[PDB]
Homo-oligomer: A and B are copies of this chain.
């Protein structure tokens, strides 16, 4: 229940709205809490919430605290955290629950409270917290982890991004409003806070700044400046300054530390404040603290559920931070092999600026641990940086970096020569930029190891990138990655996506795909709240039908379905192409196998070979009809219209058995090609134990008879949590396996290991 008291838009509204001298408001809480829980955890049965709140206030009164974040945090800390071996640690049985909470709130305040009311033996703040297990710790020490999927918030944890916003408030504003016009975030904002708007966005931000300033003043216990007396209504804190009596008083005050916005600064400040409030608190300041913490929470939730702010990450500070976190608190790096994922910039200058930032951060990180002749002690150009770095050797004390550019796929625009033409323009621009840096400085190839195509999948199908990946490979890009199976209209659609990616992308042995959630989710737990019919694009429908037939051709027990799919595909092809003659599904496949070809090859230096890859096709005499059909499909306005058109599909169009057969065929292809899957933890799953990761890893009662091992690797990317970590999710997996599956800790450690070593084995890093 506690989480609602710290994360509630309605609570924020009521607190901010009511004056600072109101008092005797605990009803506003109990009511607002029942609301917020109704919205968020709707499923609670109308009495459990009552009882939980009642028991909470029961505890509060019994322990003689005032309803407030002091008491709440004390409860949370005593309930979750302990002092154990080294620094406070968290209970193994309660870990999943801690994560469920971190999905809603920030650890740092709880951490400070635990230090205050239960300090360990006479610490440096470190996020995230962890449980303990000796065997797992020994494993991590002996082998360290290997980060393979970190691209959620740039690559950083959000709690720092909030501090970053307070550092550059105006900038986060800019980013907000630029996008506020975009519909999507309008819906997101309404869904989170209906009456959010950039106006109150600014208000809340500047208010939070005010609160932190004032509460810091009192934390230093400084003679409580007079203007607090005038300060009577929280909205008075919506301005950069306040008017006491004719004079306008700002809020800035002197803080011991230089990085005024440092997480450590905040740690020390809250620690002191809580210490001073160990026994009681002024209700006004305490209301300031609720409002501060709440604003933090909702802003953070918005951020996670989500350009200039990222550009502000273009200094060798954020990346150095990333690297210091990746390294543990010990002399040896906690992780072994890091993947550094970065968004490409359309400007060569921005590109090189980012690259130099990353490289300098890495060099400084390594220097902070090793002593050696650095040639250029103060390098200034990527050349000098590489000159420094090449002297580095793979001992394993520090992290080993592998860098990858993102490819973001945008929805096709209203008018263009062929689908995604403009997006392809942009991507070729970025790629030309990249290859030309490679030319200028060939040494980077030891560092730019692979290129990944990410973002929401429906905006573009993979084949748009096969020529891109091919030209990049010839440029010298080892490794390639492409997000798949994550989001889709129909599970069959995701499976089709994955397999086409397989059969089209220039992927070599050991390459890694990404999410592939389509081959992870069962049909059983894939429909749990969905409508009985699903609208989806006509073109994708046709591709799915073709794919189904292709796969189920050989399966005797689904031949009915195969013949069907052939027939419906034929009909759909006639309508979409508005065909006049007869078309065979054979011909349709001949058409659709061509989708890896560049549009502007011959039907519309390094790019030559692919320019002419249409030449052998056109040379092929019997392919006439496929070529013309492919051309129409690309260009014909009518065809593109029907492609955009939508159609319903039966929820249960294919039996779960047919779906599983398709999935297992796909896994067969995957193992054949020795291609791995970065599986991080993340919608439909009520509990993590339902996670398909387990289905692959072979859990009795979860793995399916026709399943094959798919070389899965670890990914520290959980969309809806704060201060997530690769170690954190290693703990997650271990604990869930041990407890919900009763496997011995040695077994569970082995099981998470094999994934960990998959990561290393298929590491993109130079050898």
Where the two chains meet, the residues of A that have a C-beta atom closer than 8 Å to any C-beta of B are: 1, 31, 34-35, 38-39, 41-45, 47-48, 51-52, 54-55, 58, 94, 97, 183, 186-187, 190-191, 194, 458, 487, 489, 528-532, 534-536, 645-648, 683-684
Contacts and interface: CB of A to CB of B under 8 A. Distances in A.
Given A190-B35, A191-B35, A43 B529 contact: yes
Contacts of A51: 489, 534-536, 646
A646 B45 contact: no
Given A35-B190, A55-B535, A528 B47 contact: no
A187, A532, A534, A684 pick with most chain B CB within 10 angstroms: A187
Nearest to A646: B55
Copy total for this chain: 2
Given A41-B529, A487-B45, A535 B54 contact: yes
Report, nearest first, the 6 A-B pairs whose CB atoms are least far apart: A55-B535, A43-B529, A51-B535, A55-B646, A38-B191, A35-B190
26 contacts: A31-B183, A31-B186, A31-B187, A35-B194, A38-B191, A41-B529, A43-B528, A43-B684, A44-B530, A45-B530, A45-B683, A45-B684, A47-B487, A47-B489, A48-B489, A48-B534, A48-B535, A51-B489, A51-B534, A51-B535, A51-B536, A52-B531, A54-B535, A55-B646, A58-B645, A58-B646
Given A42-B42, A58-B646, 20 more contacts: A1-B531, A31-B183, A31-B186, A31-B187, A38-B187, A41-B529, A43-B529, A43-B684, A45-B684, A48-B530, A48-B534, A51-B489, A52-B535, A54-B646, A55-B535, A55-B646, A55-B647, A55-B648, A58-B645, A94-B532
Contact of A529 (B44, B54, B191): B44
A217 to B, nearest CB: 37
Nearest to A1: B531
Nearest to A183: B31
Given A48-B534, A531-B1, A646-B54, A683 B187 contact: no
Nearest to A79: B533
A493 to B, nearest CB: 11
A187 B48 contact: no
A35 B42 CA distance: 16
Contacts of A34: 187
Contacts of A191: 35, 38
Contacts of A683: 43, 45
B48 A531 contact: yes
A197 to B, nearest CB: 14
A31 B34 CA distance: 27
B58 A458 contact: no
